[PDB]
Each structure stands twice: as structure tokens, then as C-alpha cells.
Design a protein around this ligand. Structure first.
Ligand SMILES: *[C@@H]1O[C@H](CO)[C@@H](O)[C@H](O)[C@H]1NC(C)=O
Ligand SMILES: *[C@@H]1O[C@H](CO)[C@@H](O)[C@H](O)[C@H]1NC(C)=O
Lengths: 48, 48
């Protein structure tokens, strides 16, 4: 990113086994943002 | 462990191909369980 701060993260669910018994009813998603110069990162996790 | 023989006891040169697979669960579909399993992952090998 960089124009103004934005990212459109489309994720394909085809590799995920949607339609079977490998379900836990929960999809854990973690999102981490870093910076070019500083090695600092910010992490944000949640359950869909 | 496959073999093949003529009527009078003769070897048979040729191609022997084996294909093995099945269905996954076939719940019923629609008002039951619409999308389920796959077409069944079918594998295939051939030999001489
Ligand atoms: C964010 O806003 C809407 C809702 O998801 C979407 O249509 C739009 O494309 C998104 N914008 C970006 C820059 O990802
Ligand atoms: C096995 O047979 C199927 C028939 O649809 C074919 O598509 C597949 O390529 C065959 N296996 C190999 C290794 O070629």
C-alpha cells in the first residue's frame, strides 16, 4: 500500500474445504502490517 | 498383483491400466445437505 493507506485483500476459499466435515465453524485470520524502514509490525487476529 | 493368460496358457503382452476411486459422503443435497464432498478424487496408473 502507500497511496493513502488501503488494501483490498480478496482471498479465494477454493483451497479451503468448504462443503465437507473438516469444518470447525471458525476461520482464524491474522493481519500484520509492517513498514519499509522500521522493522516494527502491528498484528491483529480475529475469528470469522 | 495382476496376471493375465490366454486359453492355452500363454502370456499376453499389452497395456494394463488400473483406475480406483469412490464417492465421499453423498448426504442427499438440497433441503438436506446441498454441497458435499467432491466428485471423488480419482487416481489412475498404467503399466506394461
Ligand atoms: C473497501 O470498501 C468497500 C467495502 O469492502 C469495497 O467495495 C472497496 O473496494 C474497498 N476499498 C479498498 C481500497 O479496498
Ligand atoms: C486416468 O484416466 C483419466 C480418465 O478421465 C484421465 O483423465 C487421466 O489422465 C488418466 N491418468 C493419467 C495418469 O493419465
Amino acid at each position: 500500500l502507500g497511496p493513502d493507506g488501503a488494501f483490498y485483500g480478496v482471498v479465494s476459499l477454493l483451497p479451503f474445504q468448504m462443503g465437507q466435515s473438516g469444518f470447525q465453524m471458525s476461520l482464524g485470520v491474522a493481519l500484520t502490517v509492517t513498514e519499509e524502514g522500521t522493522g516494527i509490525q502491528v498484528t491483529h487476529q480475529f475469528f470469522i | 498383483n495382476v496376471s493375465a493368460i490366454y486359453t492355452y496358457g500363454q502370456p499376453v503382452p499389452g497395456s494394463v491400466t488400473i483406475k480406483c476411486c469412490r464417492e465421499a459422503s453423498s448426504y442427499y443435497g438440497r433441503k438436506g445437505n446441498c454441497f458435499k464432498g467432491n466428485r471423488g478424487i480419482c487416481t489412475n496408473i498404467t503399466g506394461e
